[PDB]
């Protein structure tokens, strides 16, 4: 492994970070959400937003259920605040436990299947430009200035676009170690 990560739970900020997400997810604050709304949002933006063949749309849904799957949610059931975070620990310990192990986590194939649909040319890596048409269709972030923060966290190439590899590592410090160097990486949209 190339970095050592170790989780972080009981920091406020790392609780709060998941339930601004929790929040952002719960559209209509039912206080509960479920798998089975997390897969068709995710099918939604790539087929109805971002151009996805079937097949890549198919790959897409596949990950994100996973990946929401890791953390406890299931299809025709309505998880809760305090499941959730429960969930996420799991998620997050289980993650860092591959990683540690150089063994594929969620989150990066997540991101490849999502990668071969906003990367114009399939080569694993992402524009500007196609950073905020998928922010910007998910909502994860709204605006323009913070679309562009996040080319500024993260290692870019000379030719100025966004590798899988290196989001990848800023994903596992962002959403599940509290990594300090990751701050900032959705820019103000999340905190
Ligand atoms: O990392 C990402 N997250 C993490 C999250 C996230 C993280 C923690 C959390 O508690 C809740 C949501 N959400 C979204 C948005 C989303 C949510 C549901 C369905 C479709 C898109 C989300 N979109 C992603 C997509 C992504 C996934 C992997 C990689 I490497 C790069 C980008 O962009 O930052």
């Known amino acids: 492994a190339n970095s050592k990560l170790t989780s972080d739970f009981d920091n406020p900020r790392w609780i709060g970070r998941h339930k601004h997400m929790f929040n952002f997810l719960d559209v209509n604050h039912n206080g509960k959400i479920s798998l089975d709304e997390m897969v068709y949002?995710?099918?939604?933006?790539?087929?109805?937003?971002?151009?996805?063949?079937?097949?890549?749309?198919?790959?897409?849904?596949?990950?994100?259920?996973?990946?929401?799957?890791?953390?406890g949610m299931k299809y025709?059931?309505?998880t809760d605040w305090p499941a959730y975070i429960e969930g996420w620990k799991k998620l997050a310990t289980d993650?860092?436990?591959?990683?540690?192990?150089?063994?594929?986590?969620?989150?990066?194939?997540?991101?490849?299947?999502?990668?071969?649909?906003?990367?114009?040319?399939?080569?694993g890596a992402i524009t500007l430009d196609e950073w905020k048409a998928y922010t910007k269709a998910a909502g994860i972030i709204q605006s323009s200035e913070d679309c562009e923060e996040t080319f500024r966290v993260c290692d870019i190439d000379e030719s100025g676009q966004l590798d899988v590899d290196e989001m990848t590592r800023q994903h596992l410090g962002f959403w599940y170690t509290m990594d300090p160097a990751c701050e900032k990486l959705y820019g103000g949209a999340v905190p």
């Open 95 to 123: 993650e860092l436990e591959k990683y540690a192990k150089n063994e594929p986590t969620l989150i990066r194939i997540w991101g490849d299947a999502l990668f071969d649909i906003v990367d114009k040319d399939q080569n």
């Open 41 to 71: 949002k995710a099918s939604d933006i790539v087929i109805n937003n971002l151009g996805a063949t079937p097949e890549q749309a198919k790959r897409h849904k596949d990950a994100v259920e996973a990946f929401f799957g890791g953390a």
């Open 76 to 78: 025709g059931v309505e």
